[PDB]
Design a protein around this ligand. Structure first.
Ligand SMILES: Cc1cc2nc3c(=O)[nH]c(=O)nc-3n(C[C@H](O)[C@H](O)[C@H](O)COP(=O)(O)O)c2cc1C
Ligand SMILES: Cc1cc2nc3c(=O)[nH]c(=O)nc-3n(C[C@H](O)[C@H](O)[C@H](O)COP(=O)(O)O)c2cc1C
Ligand SMILES: N[C@@H](Cc1ccc(O)c(I)c1)C(=O)O
Ligand SMILES: N[C@@H](Cc1ccc(O)c(I)c1)C(=O)O
Ligand SMILES: N[C@@H](Cc1ccc(O)c(I)c1)C(=O)O
Ligand SMILES: [Cl-]
Ligand SMILES: [Cl-]
Ligand SMILES: [Cl-]
Ligand SMILES: [Cl-]
Ligand SMILES: [Cl-]
Ligand SMILES: [Cl-]
Ligand SMILES: [Cl-]
Lengths: 184, 185
C-alpha cells in the first residue's frame, strides 16, 4: 500500500555503521528517474559520496555554516529547532555510509520543481528498500558544490545521507488535509 | 509489485473521461501527499479542488490565452520539443477533467516550494494507484488563475493538476538511463 509506505516514512538522522548495498540506492534512483519532468528533460543528476575524507570535508563546511545560522536564527524557526532539539551539529554527514547529492540541470524548464518531485519518488523508494534518509539543506550550497567539483550547469538541491536507520526518533505529526473547493 | 513498477507505468494523462471519480479517490491522493516530509514539518501544501464548470471554463480560457501568446513567442529548446511533439495552445483537458486540483505553497514556510513539489511526487504516485490520471500543468502566468480563485496573498499557485479517469492517453515518453557519479565530478 502506497499510503502505508508514505505514512511510515520518517526522517532518519542516525544510521548504522554497516553500508547498505549500492544496488538499493541505485534502485531508488531508477524509481526517481521514472518521474515526470518539464519537457521530459529528466533534469536530475546524482552524485554518491562514500569517500570518508570527502564526507568529513562536507560535514565540516556544513557545520561551520550551520553554526552561524544557529547563532543568528530567531522567531518561529528558532522555536521549532529548539523544541525539536536541533543544533548546528550534523554528525550524520560523516557517519552515513553514503551521501546522495541531488542536482538539477539549470537550463531545463521547471528543472527545480521537477527534481523535487523526483525526490518524492526517491524517498518512497528508499523507504521501500528499508533505508533511511533526511533531505539535508545547508545554509550554503556553494561550498559543498565546490568540494565535489560541481559543473556550472548543475545546481545542488539537497544532500541525502543514506544508510540503515539506527533507532530513529518518531515521525512528527501530520495535520489532516483540509481541502477547499472552487475558490477561497 | 514494486514501487518501480508503479513509477514506470505512470505517465502523463491529457485525455480524460468526463465521468466523475468518487471524491474519496482524489482525497486519498491528498492524504498520501500529506504524509510527505517538508521543511520544518510546515506541511506547506494547500489544495483547491475546482469542479464548477463555469470556473473551469474561466481557468481554461485564461490559460489558453496565455498559452497562445507563449506559443507565438517561445523559441529554443522548449519550442523545439513542443513542436516535435505537436503541442498546441489549446487545453481541452482543463474542460474535460472532472477535477482541477490546484496545488498551492505557503510562501512563508521554509523550503515551501521544494516541499510542495516533493509532495506532488507522492500525489502523482497515489493517483496512479487509484487508476486516475493527471498532468502537472504549468501555464505561463499563474497570477491570472490565482485571481480567478481568490488566492490569498499568503499562497502561491504551484501547479494545476487536472485529475480524472484516463481516456486512452498517449504512450509514456522515453527515459534516459539515470546519471550517477561517485564522490566527485
Ligand atoms: C514541473 C513540470 C511542469 C510541467 N508542465 C507541463 C505543462 O505545462 N503542460 C503539459 O502538457 N505538460 C507539463 N508537464 C508534463 C511533462 O511534459 C511530462 O511529465 C513529460 O513529458 C514526461 O511525460 P511522461 O512521464 O509521460 O513520459 C510538466 C511536468 C513537470 C514535472
Ligand atoms: C525541503 C526540505 C528541507 C529539509 N531540510 C532539512 C534540514 O536542513 N535539516 C534537517 O534536519 N531536516 C531537514 N528536512 C527534514 C524535515 O525537518 C522533516 O521532513 C520534517 O521535520 C518532518 O519529518 P517527519 O516525516 O519525520 O515527521 C528537510 C525537509 C524538506 C522537505
Ligand atoms: N505549458 C505549455 C508548454 C509546456 C508543455 C509541456 C511541458 O512539459 C512544459 I515545462 C511546458 C503547454 O501546456 O502546452
Ligand atoms: N539546516 C538546519 C535547519 C533546519 C532543520 C530542519 C528543517 O526541516 C529545516 I527547512 C532547516 C539544520 O539541519 O539543523
Ligand atoms: N530556494 C529558492 C526557492 C525556489 C525557487 C525556484 C524553485 O524552482 C524552487 I523548487 C524553489 C529561494 O528561496 O529563493
Ligand atoms: Cl525527512
Ligand atoms: Cl522526450
Ligand atoms: Cl506528467
Ligand atoms: Cl512538528
Ligand atoms: Cl468547463
Ligand atoms: Cl514563494
Ligand atoms: Cl494523453
Amino acid at each position: 500500500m502506497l499510503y502505508d509506505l508514505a505514512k511510515k516514512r520518517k526522517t532518519v538522522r542516525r544510521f548504522k555503521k554497516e553500508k547498505p548495498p549500492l544496488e538499493d540506492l541505485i534502485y531508488s534512483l531508477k524509481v526517481a528517474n521514472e518521474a515526470p519532468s518539464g519537457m521530459n528533460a529528466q533534469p536530475w543528476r546524482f552524485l554518491i559520496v562514500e569517500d570518508e575524507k570527502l564526507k568529513g570535508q562536507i560535514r565540516r563546511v556544513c557545520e561551520r555554516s550551520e553554526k552561524t545560522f544557529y547563532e543568528n536564527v530567531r522567531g518561529r524557526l528558532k522555536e521549532w529547532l529548539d523544541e525539536k532539539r536541533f543544533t548546528w551539529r550534523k554528525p550524520f554527514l560523516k557517519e552515513a555510509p553514503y551521501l546522495l547529492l541531488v542536482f538539477s540541470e539549470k537550463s531545463a524548464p521547471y528543472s527545480r520543481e521537477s527534481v523535487w518531485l523526483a525526490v518524492g519518488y526517491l524517498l518512497l523508494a528508499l523507504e521501500e528498500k528499508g533505508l533511511g534518509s533526511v533531505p539535508y539543506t545547508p545554509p550554503d550550497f556553494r561550498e559543498v558544490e565546490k568540494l565535489v567539483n560541481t559543473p556550472s550547469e548543475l545546481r545542488l538541491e539537497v544532500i541525502l545521507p543514506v544508510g540503515y536507520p539506527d533507532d530513529p526518533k518518531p515521525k512528527y505529526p501530520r495535520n489532516e488535509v483540509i481541502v477547499r473547493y472552487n475558490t477561497f
